[PDB]
Ligand binder design. Structure first.
Ligand code: FES
Ligand code: FES
Ligand code: FES
Ligand code: FES
Ligand SMILES: [Cl-]
Ligand SMILES: [Cl-]
Ligand SMILES: [Cl-]
Ligand SMILES: [Cl-]
Ligand SMILES: [Mg+2]
Ligand SMILES: [Mg+2]
Ligand SMILES: [Mg+2]
Ligand SMILES: [Mg+2]
Ligand SMILES: [Mg+2]
Ligand SMILES: [Mg+2]
Lengths: 907, 907
């Protein structure tokens, strides 16, 4: 051990450390500076950036031996605090740079380092700095972060007053549609919002820390578990196995379709008889620290009989493949789509037909914060779980029978969280922590490392797809045929539903009167399927939007004009036979047209012999809602202090549940003149917030936004004075009148799609958009650079523009990843950010352009649709269409790795 | 466990706690708010004061169940931080209210609570508030704390500008003699100085926490130790016993006098054969936390044969008493005092003689911070100990042979510390932590609780005393006889030396030509003797100063005039035959006289039938230095940045080692124009600071102050340019000239007192003072209230007036405790602050008056003497003399408990 006397955030610290210890651990654990965020732990994400003697370093890869006596360290806590914000922190707030907020401390500390060395950077200088310092963000698409740096620099340079970093209320006093900052932004930019791992450090002494004993083969029969050596190891309390589970030890898919051949109870909580994928949790070590639990977990011995594993859909779907879940065929679900007339004769007599085989793979979510959860037994006898769940009520019912609790005896709460992008539509760690809390009676905390986040959370499910179009010479679509195979890994939850998305979204955007198709879901031993932003659209619309370009090529027609000819107009129906609710695609195409033509001309002029430029188009469509007559609930409560609490379970991945609530309520409460800072939101909790439903399906703004609107309308009625005006809280309480008022809303016009035909009216509100990608391909290396993305977006009406702009930039960046670099195919190689192709700042163009073409929705609150998933519906199709434009090469199977592109160029 | 969402220092905290947990533990351990200081842990000291929903509460006695959802908590960290100080914190700094600083956060938080309820308090309102809230201070005497509250309130009230709370540099630029604030004050008032227990919380995961297995009888032969149950208990690593000690397992007294009958190696590190006092450490449990170590320590079984214990000096000194240390008589040392002619004939022929038997007991130090230390093996192979040692070099040599290390292999460092008042002139926990670090190879931390601080640290040693005077009718002293018996408990360290103090200080202040006396030291089984501020003078001068009043009474002379007649004047010698170095007592008496006469008149006028007022006088004298030719060393270093570091081992109990260094160096460096903020001090460290010696004997200002002066003079010579002016660092470095320059100083004129006669010249500088106490006795109850204290003090020249004023107020308050309420006699009853008679604010008058009558010392730096122990030399004699003045009752045996006073009143 060594004494080190240093200065941290301006205060002399008399430190006692192990010279081998990581600075991140010292700062977080010994000094309580949990504003230093840790994600990857491998020096790849910059979340743990700190200033050390004037240099920006990653604290997770800086040992204490590199910190000299007398060193100066700055963390986010030293940059500024609430009520003493630095210009960078004010700028972040103003520009909406904190979505999940997990990367915000590291970017801000890194930026301070930049500005201390270059007071007046160009935008390009800012991008070069964040690239060099590995500052990664999965939410924002980087552009808002650069905007914030530039604004702060101008203030620091005396070129503009600091007061201009503070939001100015619009003239009308309306925050709906404005850039009003989100309530959680100050806490995020100051490092004072506690995420799950931060909460773990601030839990009491009694708390047990868990480590997973995980399968290191993809498929096996389990013969036994020997814990004897682990029990003798430092700090070890106990080891938990399936024997300690008090219920069924299975997670239920809950809404398993009746035509599914499996019962939906296939997923274990702790493996008993079998390993179904690499990483499966077989046991939990409980110890005094994460480090001691992990060390002991390595000594637990599992006796296994390894079985042949099926690592892709086609492999597992073979007619003679062995049943992974004995008694259920590996192909466990099929969804037909049967619209209009038989397609065979129409294809035979059509002027033109095209066909393609496409593949979209196992995209990894890659939030900067790896999964984390904790649980405890309350003094009320109930089991409490605090996790990254974005469907607290959903998950309660998915896990309660398995853990052995009635629903009233379990409470699920959503912690502040550093992004999910859908992986938390699935249970991950909730049942594990519940089982351990119940078995030990003690508080328990489980943190995944980044390898476990990659290997042992669910993934976008690969789809192998064949799609065909028949059309007239003038471009009018006549018919479509479709076939898709969905590799869902071993656990069925929502796999059938994902497969149904193919019937709804393959070919969406166009009038197609005649469709015949079939989706099939298959169990495999690769990673189980969890929702990933877009949930079947990124697969479906990659195929159809690439195929539209192929059809345009075969017709000798411009691909934007082919889309114009076919885009939904009054009278048309979507693939499930439903009329669209608004008709904005022609408007969006007309507004994009001159920009597209100019981009074509620029690409022609600026192309060189070695660097070929191209422009690509696609349409995107997705529903806002869960299928059928989805619903939500909110309570609007006038508090004694005159503030209003809007109680919901709107789960915040980081997308903006806080600002969605405040902005929607503010608009609904305007008759009573309620200031936005007086409106409070509630963190999701199954005991004390209503069942607003999950934050999946780009649904909350529509469903919970409407419920909030109705609750607030009902509160206004409750407060109305006869003669005009409004009663105060004290007046209502004196009259023994209610102050907490419910609102509900249901998407009553919706129906579930039919099991035989696929037809129905699954959503009452959709999102619509048109993408344009501008790319350069180096034809010597095959490397593609995306130079610009544009999204024409119809969101109906914006609740908050900082929220929507950011959602779109984030989704476009994930689209660039999906197109060019991202997969989870190789269990080890793809288990790091860099290995799996995470997009760092230089991979995302600074030119991300949005054009809102909003057509107010009949059923949306104040006319709003959702936004969340719109920007990832088909940006990757636009990008691949642009590669084709540039070079003549079509990539059919994502991603467009350089070698793959080169092989196609040279064929 | 329960979730609690509350606000702490203005920030929302999502807390997870045990409802039974103490708020102090939650704030310190879970939230890292170590500005919440914990001392007593029993709700008696206020150090852990926090604001909870507008009320000031003691966090160590507030369970989390009393903290409601939505509660607001403020700690010192929420009051203000460095560079954002609250007016209370600025005022504390300006008024010198932080000495050790341990109580400062709690007083400041408590004061904020006061001012939030009463914006314009009277001084009396402030005293009532701190009494009610149990805010205890052992350093300051409370008056500076009240001054600070009043000044802050005026600013908060807009009656004066906040800038007036900031120190204004004197016209001359001289900080010597000024009220310049101490360098450590900002850290103390903000809770950002880490004391030993705070450092323990910020140590790494690997650190083992220790608990003592202690004797629960006063005297025994040990037969065995059974650790088997303790080893099976939660979190337990190992148990350490004498078998694990690698050296002699004895602490050496090091300077044991040759005429001592014992070898000075009597004290074990871990008991082997015997228990010698209640509390002796027999074993150490090493565990993952203090709580787990303590639980397991209760299960360690010690097999003992209890022996009859001698619990007082007279008991152990009986001719037939059994030897506690077999082979050494219990009375192990005698010091004669033989000055001038045989006293018997002079007593026989004298006009008047008086005699008395007096007792001063086992006063407990009662710092607000209980003992704490830690140790580790450095990467350099050396053992490091960080503790409350106020003699790091001394303790290194006292413990190295016992722990089994050569001196170069052990390093002792003084942590910031919350007061000692002498108990840390002894080793307490240093050898214990060293043994455990060496045995385990791991860092170890040991915190005593307040019961252990009381029972198992050393104490003022009781003295049973008989003193006699012979005098002429005119009051001229002719002769003195003296006999004293010193109960030193079982461990000999510095016991012989303490006994020698009796020869030096009984009767000090007066010319007494003929003295015959004898001091004897006896081992007992009550608590071992450690220095307590005054170190033999409080005993010695209680006897002589009470006896002077008895002599005045028998002569019918005023007691101030009897002192005037006899006080040292040129030609006189002190008891050891040495001429005083200055003669300030007549000056001080003349200046006090009218104040004394006025106080007598006020007491006559304001006395009632039931409440009798009195006035009492005493003189105090003590040396500044260790005996003989004491010495110190300092290094003055010009740093590259133009600052100057003055390297010393001046140990800071809280008295002001920092400001002593800065002020002394500033004065010495004035020719070169060095600003005070450019002068740095060093925390004591045996490897990297010179052997400046211990902070005992009121010696550092003289000895180390002189060494600092000489070092700085030598640095000026090193920096001098030919032609005039001074070279800069860069100029000296370019010329390959030295920048780190040594200075030494030795008290060359001093000699050790003789073993046969007691005569010698032990100190070259003394401190001199005259006390006046004003008291009221309730003759129905026997309760004495001290209404005023005055000290005329000759300190030569003041280094810093905030430091000296505070030292005097602190010592006067300890004098009130010693006189009226304090003892450690009953092992259990006296093991709490309240039980042992700690003086809370109402016990200390707001009227504490100082008058400096400074006569510059020939050998002091810039003429300075020490101050530390002067104010505790005899204030308790003045107080008892005042009780006599009021009521006619003399208390001979301290303390003057009410029942004792009543029995005397009614006799
Ligand atoms: S770079 Fe340190 S946590 Fe990712
Ligand atoms: S805001 Fe950057 S990772 Fe979420
Ligand atoms: S009153 Fe809480 S530590 Fe003393
Ligand atoms: S300053 Fe108050 S206890 Fe030391
Ligand atoms: Cl391909
Ligand atoms: Cl490649
Ligand atoms: Cl008495
Ligand atoms: Cl009493
Ligand atoms: Mg500022
Ligand atoms: Mg079954
Ligand atoms: Mg038509
Ligand atoms: Mg202020
Ligand atoms: Mg011996
Ligand atoms: Mg004389």
């Amino acid at each position: 051990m060594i004494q080190k006397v240093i200065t941290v955030n301006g205060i002399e610290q008399n430190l006692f450390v192990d010279a081998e210890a990581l600075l991140s651990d010292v700062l977080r654990q010994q000094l309580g500076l949990t504003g230093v965020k840790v994600g990857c732990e491998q020096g790849q994400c910059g979340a743990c950036s700190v200033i050390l003697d004037g240099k920006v370093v990653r604290a997770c890869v800086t040992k204490m031996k590199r910190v000299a006596d007398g060193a100066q360290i700055t963390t986010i806590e030293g940059v500024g605090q609430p009520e003493n914000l630095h210009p960078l922190q004010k700028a972040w707030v103003l520009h909406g740079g904190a979505q999940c907020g997990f990367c915000s401390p590291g970017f801000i500390v890194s930026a301070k380092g930049l500005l201390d060395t270059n007071a007046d950077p160009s935008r390009e200088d800012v991008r070069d700095w964040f690239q060099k310092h590995r500052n990664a963000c999965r939410c924002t698409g980087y552009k808002p972060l650069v905007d914030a740096v530039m604004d702060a620099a101008a203030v620091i340079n005396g070129k503009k007053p600091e007061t201009d970093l503070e939001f100015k209320m619009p003239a009308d006093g309306r925050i709906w549609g404005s850039k009003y900052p989100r309530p959680t932004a100050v806490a995020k930019v100051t490092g004072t919002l506690d995420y799950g791992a931060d909460l773990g450090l601030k839990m009491p002494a009694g708390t047990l820390h868990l480590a997973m004993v995980q399968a290191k083969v993809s498929h096996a029969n389990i013969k036994g578990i020997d814990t004897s050596e682990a029990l003798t190891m430092p700090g070890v309390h106990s080891v938990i196995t399936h024997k300690d589970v008090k219920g069924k030890n299975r997670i239920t898919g809950l809404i398993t379709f009746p035509t599914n051949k499996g019962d939906g109870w296939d997923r274990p909580i702790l493996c008993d008889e079998k390993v179904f994928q690499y990483g499966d949790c077989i046991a939990l070590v409980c110890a005094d620290s994460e480090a001691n639990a992990r060390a002991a977990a390595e000594k637990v011995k599992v006796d296994l009989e390894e079985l042949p594993a099926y690592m892709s859909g086609p492999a597992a779907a073979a007619e003679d493949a062995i049943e992974i879940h004995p008694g259920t065929p590996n192909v466990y679900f099929e969804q037909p789509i049967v619209k209009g007339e038989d397609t065979g004769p129409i294809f035979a007599s059509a002027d033109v037909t095209v066909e393609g085989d496409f593949y979209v793979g196992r995209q990894p979510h890659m939030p900067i914060e790896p999964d984390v959860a904790f649980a405890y037994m309350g003094d009320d006898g109930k089991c409490y779980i605090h996790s990254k769940s974005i469907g607290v009520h959903l998950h309660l019912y998915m896990i309660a029978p398995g853990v052995g609790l009635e629903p009233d005896q379990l409470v699920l709460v959503a912690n502040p969280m550093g992004g999910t992008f859908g992986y938390k539509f699935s249970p991950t760690s909730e049942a594990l922590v519940a089982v351990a809390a119940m078995a030990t009676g003690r508080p328990v905390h489980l943190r995944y490392n980044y390898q476990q986040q990659q290997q042992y959370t669910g993934k976008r499910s690969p789809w192998e797809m064949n799609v065909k179009f028949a059309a007239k010479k003038d471009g009018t679509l006549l018919a479509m045929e479709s076939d898709w195979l969905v590799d869902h890994g071993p656990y069925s939850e929502f796999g059938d539903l994902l497969t149904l998305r193919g019937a709804q979204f393959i070919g969406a955007g166009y009038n197609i009167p005649n469709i015949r198709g079939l989706g099939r879901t298959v169990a495999t031993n690769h990673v189980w399927g969890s929702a990933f932003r877009g949930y079947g659209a990124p697969q479906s619309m990659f195929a159809s939007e690439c195929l539209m370009d192929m059809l345009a090529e075969k017709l000798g027609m411009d691909p934007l004009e082919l889309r114009y000819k076919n885009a939904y107009r009054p009278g048309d129906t979507n693939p499930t036979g439903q009329e669209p609710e608004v008709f904005s695609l022609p408007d969006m195409i007309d507004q994009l047209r001159p920009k597209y033509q100019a981009a074509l001309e620029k690409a022609q002029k600026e192309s060189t012999a070695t660097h070929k430029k191209g422009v690509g188009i696609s349409i995107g469509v997705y529903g806002s809602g869960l299928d059928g007559p989805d619903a939500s609930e909110a309570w609007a409560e006038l508090n004694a202090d005159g503030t209003i609490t809007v109680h919901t379970a709107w789960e915040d991945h980081g997308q903006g549940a806080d600002i969605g609530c405040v902005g929607t309520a503010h608009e609904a409460l305007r008759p009573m003149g309620v200031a936005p800072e007086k409106i409070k939101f509630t963190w999701p909790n199954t005991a004390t917030t209503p069942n607003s439903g999950p934050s999946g399906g780009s649904r909350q703004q529509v469903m919970t936004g409407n419920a909030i609107r109705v609750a607030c309308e009902n509160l206004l009625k409750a407060c109305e004075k006869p003669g005009g005006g409004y009663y105060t809280y004290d007046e209502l309480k004196a009259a023994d009148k209610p102050t907490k008022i419910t609102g509900n809303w249901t998407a009553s016009g919706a129906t579930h799609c039919d099991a035989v035909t696929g037809l129905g009216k699954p959503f009452v509100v959709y999102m619509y958009g048109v993408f344009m990608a501008e790319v350069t391909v180096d034809v010597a290396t095959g490397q593609t650079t995306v130079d610009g993305m544009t999204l024409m977006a119809d969101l109906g009406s914006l609740c908050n523009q900082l929220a929507t702009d950011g959602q779109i930039y984030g989704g476009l960046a994930q689209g660039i990843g999906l197109a060019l670099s991202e997969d989870f195919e190789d269990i080890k190689k793809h288990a790091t950010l860099v290995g799996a192709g995470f997009p760092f700042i230089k991979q995302i163009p600074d030119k991300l352009d949005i054009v809102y073409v909003n057509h107010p929705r009949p059923d949306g609150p104040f006319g709003a649709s959702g936004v969340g998933e719109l920007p990832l519906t088909s940006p990757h199709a636009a990008i691949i269409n642009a590669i084709k434009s540039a070079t003549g090469v079509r990539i059919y199977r994502l991603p467009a790795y350089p070698e793959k592109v080169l092989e196609a160029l040279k064929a």
